[PDB]
Every structure is written in structure tokens, then in C-alpha cells.
Amino acid sequence: GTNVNDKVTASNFKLEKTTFDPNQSGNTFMAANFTVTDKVKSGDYFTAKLPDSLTGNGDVDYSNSNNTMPIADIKSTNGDVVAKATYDILTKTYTFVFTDYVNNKENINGQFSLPLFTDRAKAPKSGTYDANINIADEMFNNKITYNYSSPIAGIDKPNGANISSQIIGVDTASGQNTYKQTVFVNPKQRVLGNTWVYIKGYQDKIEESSGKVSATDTKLRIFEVNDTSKLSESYYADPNDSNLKEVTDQFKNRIYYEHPNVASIKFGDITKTYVVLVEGHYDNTGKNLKTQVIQENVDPVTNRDYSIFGWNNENVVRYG
């Protein structure tokens, strides 16, 4: 079919909320009505384009589903399906493809409501961004504000343990059941001694998380950060960023899977912040993916003042 954006008009455009914390499952929604001005055929389609600051998928990853996010059918005013929808992760564009519905009608009216999330990579810092959305070649302007919970967290002492992390991608569609997680080791960039980091596939009870952390289920890459002030708030981290120096090879025989569902990492005495990128898997029990990372250390000078900090992750799913 043909692109029929000039034949479709969106109205009553609404954004549920303009300010939120994407590190606390903050998201928003967009709702609009549309009407087909002219007659169109089955197969014809119209689109919506998100701006740089937004994504239609958030922390759900569709890279194993051809980078294409399936969307719930779009309905007429009358409750029947007018269009089947698809979201393209790469171009951040929804494509609404008219069904046979449209073949015997005129004056077709529909509406949709779709969740919207931050783009962790293009809005990596707290602040305000242009959230201008394009629907059927028309602009609907907004301002988005992200108050990210700071990744810089830890015991409040110059030599205290400090660590955080965020699950930034979960593949719930393909059946492969993968997840990507960023861990910031020592984000306060303190001088710490005998530092250990534990990446757990669960929080307090093994049976309560679908996480699966092991030598066969998990891959880790470790980066020494050069300038900590460049690090994101969104937990996005580019493994090819020149601000990151890969040291995975140095940790080759310093990562242990001595315990179930747990990756132990021996950092030792450190004075720089690290990024640990985790690619993992979760099981088929239908339990939530619930993780916890823990860093422990002592004062590098007195070998006393033991300290330990934990950080929990879990994600939520929204519907349109």
C-alpha cells in the first residue's frame, strides 16, 4: 500500500505526564484521535515519529525480534480493529497499517494510547528536552523533564562502598530471554582497598527471581572510566566510548562463579570508577527478573573500616 499521512489527521493529542524519574520506572503516555479525511485502502499506512528524547519500548529490548516492537491493534470508535501497528526501534517510528476494515467505510475514526519512555542513550543526563512528536506529518510539541535518581550512591564516607546498576534491556518477546545491565562500580571514585563486587541473579531469595547468573548464562565486560563526570545518569554506557578503557582481559582469572546465581569479581585496590556491562539470561519460571549488586571493601590504608553497599534492580511492563 501507499503512505497516507496527508489523508490522516490527529487531534485531542495528550501527554499523561511531562516530568518523571526513568530510574524509578517513570514513564508517560501519548493518546490521540485520528480521522481519515479521504478514502484509503487496506494496506495503506500512516506513521508517528518519536523525537530524540523518547522511545516507545524503554527497557524492553527487541533486538532479537528484528528490531521491531509489536503493538496492540488500533481500534475504531466502534471497537473493531482499523489498523495493525508496529514500532521500529532504529527509526523510532510507529507504522499503522489499515486493515480490510477501511474498504467499505468513509469518515473512519480511531484513537490510540501508547506508553512512552526515555531514550537512555540520547537523554543520558537529568534535565529538560524537546519532546516534539510527529503524527501523520503534523507536530505536537512538548517539553520533557527527566529527574534521574543519581547513579552516584553509596555509604556516606570517603572510603565507603559504592555501587549502582540498572537493567536497561529485557528481551521478553523472542524466547531467548536475555537482559542487558549496566553496573557502575565505585561511581564516587573513592580510593578503596580489597574491593569485591557480587552480581546476583536474585535479591534475598533465589526462588523469587527468574535471573540466571553463571559462566554459561552471563558475559561481562569491564571498563576503566577516565573522566567520571562524563558518565550518564540514565545508566547508558557506550563500550566504544573513548572515555572507557576496556580491561576485561585483565579480569580473566578474577571473576568467579563460586556461588549459585552469583558472579564474584575481585577488583582489589582501586582508585578509578568502572563500568561493568552485563549480558545475561533469565529463566522460564515466569518470575520477575530481580537483581542485586553488592560492593564491599576496606580502607586501603588501615585495612580497617570495612564497608558494604547493595543495589536492587527490577523492571515494570506498560500497555497501550
Partner: peptide, 11 residues
């Protein structure tokens, strides 16, 4: 001994 957490979301 202390801690916090964060949470994400998607569709």
C-alpha cells in the same frame, strides 16, 4: 551496611 535501588520499565 546500607543500600538502595532503581527500577526501569518498557512495553
Amino acid at each position: 551496611s546500607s543500600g538502595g535501588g532503581s527500577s526501569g520499565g518498557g512495553h
